[PDB]
């Protein structure tokens, strides 16, 4: 009973043009009651593309705008597909860069529910051919509804919406189809919109085609506002008008910025690479001669990019001590990247994962930027405000990012990985500073994720001249939708999300942890209140890190002897171990760092077992040396746990690894090169790798150990019984 009707009137005051003879009291009243059925936002979107609605008397073909139609544009087909003659019908929507909608007149749109349907049908046409066509829709989302109907139980749904063209189609409706049969798909969308808008035929649509009815329901009740937003995003004036108010709102804030202010925000956008000059300067003759004799490439804990810089240091100017050296240069040759540091520690800046000096240096800049970004977006110049961000999927899941793009057609996205990635994405967290765009902008080649974030009046941000905002750290995000969209003849994943108090997301993760222990403590016979499993979640693919823990442990349960688990995970719990599932990097989990001697003795990887804490750490985001999933990683690391308990049972006076034994070192002397190249690294890594394959979910991988690692399959099995029975 408020503003809803106000724009209805304004919008209608513009586009709606009544031109009749009979007292335009009833006439003008007809169209009112008729178009009030239509969702308000489709009316403004017609406006948006420059559309006009005309309520005329007589032969509608006898109006200005229409008299310019050829011979064909005169013979249509009603909602039912029955041919007609325009100068006989009562509605028509002309297409073209200057759209128009001509509606005859009658007060019986109340009664003639069949005609009111047609009008709505046509409007529908406007909505899928004229409006949505400009933002590349309907797309995959709607293709899905369409397919759900053809390949489904009752054949009625098809009968009510599809035509033989569609009805007789052999396979499903792929993106390629919708593309060279747009007319077709557009028609279906229209009929669905019609039956849904006309309150009488709605039931027929919900009865014989609920997938369709549900779709149109959710769409005209919310998802349509995001359509309008998209439309607006393509208009130069809209884009500039929006940018301006924002610029205005932050005007005082910016004018007050100092030089240091702009200094900080500036590095926070481009990291300082280490300068070769300083590097060399801090070396020693000892270390610098080693630097030449050193086969930098010969190391395997340095990335090719890092290794690269490391080579250039030779031109410009192994064993134990030797490699110990390369572990320090690794910490030193790292860019000074403030946002990277916040992500790597998930906001835990005091983490002793880097040299004390540089840590302090990072804390100051952060505490400072935290004060610079003190003014919230909340303004009197606007309500909902959507900001945009382009992301690289590898940032959330390198394992999935690995197969997200169709290996052949770079422009297409593999639907398989899509539903997998879409799977448990319910919430996100941001620990570093999110840099977004006021209006959406094309992305880099390696960025197939396009976020559309609804900010909160409470959200603090800084305005940038280039048209971007720098947001505050520790933001809470709820995913509201995830679909495949087309933009610039390439496919992306739109991720509609809404900002919410980080505390809210953290509480979800907190309860989740309580639940996951109240469950496995039981299934293992551990005291009701033990801290076994721990979620250390701080980054953008949060919810997935949580929901994955459950699925990892299930597989670790369904592939290993329950009695081998209990025995081992009891040893662990005894030394206060933990099963840590995290998105921050490993060198930042206490379970590892609180035990290191030197910070340069840190390890980051898919998974990692820590004896001194008896805990298994599993980093979610990455992708371990070819291991199709998180599961396998956990299990391989459990192998280390077992190698721990095993050797322990030997001479308890000193827990040592059973994989150290004189006997085993020999099994490795000949079999160590039969499994995986990675297992070929050493004993403990051969033992866990072998252990892993043995308990694989793919038996194929099991026989592989049996007919290639005999003495091993036997050794590993002995231990198991040894442990079980002890």
């Amino acid at each position: 009973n408020k503003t809803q009707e106000e724009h209805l009137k304004e919008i209608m005051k513009h586009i709606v043009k009544i031109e009749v003879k009979g007292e335009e009291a009833v006439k003008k009243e007809a169209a009112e009651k008729l178009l009030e059925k239509v969702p308000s936002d489709v009316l403004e979107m017609y406006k948006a593309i420059g559309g006009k609605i005309y309520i005329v008397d007589g032969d509608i073909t006898k109006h200005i705008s229409l008299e310019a139609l050829s011979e064909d544009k005169k013979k249509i087909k009603d909602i039912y597909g029955k041919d007609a003659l325009l100068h006989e019908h009562y509605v028509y929507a002309k297409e073209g860069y200057e759209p128009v909608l001509v509606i005859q007149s009658s007060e019986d749109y109340v009664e003639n529910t069949e005609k009111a349907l047609n009008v709505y049908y046509e409007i529908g046409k406007i909505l899928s051919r004229d409006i949505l066509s400009k933002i590349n829709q309907p797309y995959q989302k709607f293709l899905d509804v369409l397919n759900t109907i053809k390949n489904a139980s009752d054949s009625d749904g098809q009968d009510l919406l599809f035509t033989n063209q569609l009805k007789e189609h052999p396979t499903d409706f792929s993106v390629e189809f919708l593309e060279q049969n747009s007319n077709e798909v557009q028609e279906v969308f229209a009929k669905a919109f019609a039956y849904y808008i006309e309150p009488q035929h709605r039931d027929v649509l919900q009865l014989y085609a609920p997938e369709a009815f549900n779709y149109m329901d959710k769409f005209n009740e919310q998802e349509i506002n995001l359509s309008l937003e998209e439309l607006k995003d393509q208009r130069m004036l809209s884009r500039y008008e929006k940018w301006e108010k924002i610029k205005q709102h932050y005007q005082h804030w910016s004018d007050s910025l100092s030089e240091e202010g702009r200094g900080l925000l500036k590095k926070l956008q481009i990291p300082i690479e280490p300068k070769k000059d300083d590097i060399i300067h801090s070396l020693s003759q000892e270390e610098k001669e080693l630097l030449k004799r050193i086969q930098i490439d010969s190391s395997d804990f340095l990335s090719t990019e890092e290794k690269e810089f490391l080579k250039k240091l030779q031109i410009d100017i192994l064993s134990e001590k030797e490699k110990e050296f390369l572990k320090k240069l690794k910490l030193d040759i790292q860019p000074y990247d403030i946002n990277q540091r916040l992500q790597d520690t998930g906001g835990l800046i005091d983490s002793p994962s880097i040299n004390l000096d540089v840590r302090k240096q990072y804390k100051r800049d952060i505490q400072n930027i935290d004060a610079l970004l003190h003014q919230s977006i909340g303004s009197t110049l606007y309500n909902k405000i959507y900001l945009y961000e382009n992301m690289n999927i590898n940032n959330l899941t390198a394992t999935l990012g690995a197969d997200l793009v169709d290996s052949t057609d770079n422009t297409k996205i593999n639907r398989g990985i899509f539903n997998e990635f879409k799977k448990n994405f319910k919430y996100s967290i941001s620990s570093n500073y999110m840099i977004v765009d006021i209006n959406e902008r094309p992305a880099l080649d390696n960025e197939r994720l396009k976020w559309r974030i609804q900010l909160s009046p409470d959200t603090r941000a800084g305005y940038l001249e280039n048209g971007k905002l720098i947001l505050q750290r520790n933001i809470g995000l709820e995913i509201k939708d995830v679909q495949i969209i087309k933009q610039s003849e390439k496919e992306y994943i739109r991720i509609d999300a809404k900002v919410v108090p980080k505390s809210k997301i953290d509480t979800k993760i907190q309860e989740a942890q309580l639940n996951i222990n109240q469950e496995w403590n039981k299934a293992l016979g551990l005291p009701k209140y033990t801290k076994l499993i721990t979620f250390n979640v701080h980054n953008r693919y949060a919810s997935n890190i949580v929901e994955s823990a459950y699925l990892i442990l299930n597989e670790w349960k369904n592939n290993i002897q329950s009695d081998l688990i209990k025995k081992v995970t009891n040893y662990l719990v005894d030394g206060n171990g933990r099963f840590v599932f995290t998105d921050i990097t490993l060198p930042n989990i206490a379970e590892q760092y609180t035990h290191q001697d030197e910070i340069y003795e840190q390890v980051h990887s898919k998974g990692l077992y820590v004896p001194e804490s008896r805990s298994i750490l599993l980093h979610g985001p990455s992708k371990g040396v070819e291991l199709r999933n998180d599961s396998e990683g956990f299990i391989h690391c459990f192998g280390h746990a077992v190698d721990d308990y095993a050797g322990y049972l030997l001479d308890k006076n000193q827990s040592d690894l059973v994989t150290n034994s004189k006997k085993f070192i020999d099994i490795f002397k000949e079999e160590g090169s039969n499994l995986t190249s990675y297992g070929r690294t050493n004993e403990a890594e051969f033992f866990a790798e072998a252990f892993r394959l043995m308990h694989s979910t793919d038996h194929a991988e099991r026989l592989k150990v049996q007919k290639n690692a005999p003495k091993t399959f036997q050794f590993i099995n002995d231990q198991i019984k040894f442990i079980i029975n002890s």
Partner: peptide
């Protein structure tokens, strides 16, 4: 003193 890695695959 040691720990048991499980490296990823960078480039």
């Amino acid at each position: 003193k040691k720990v048991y890695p499980y490296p990823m695959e960078p480039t």
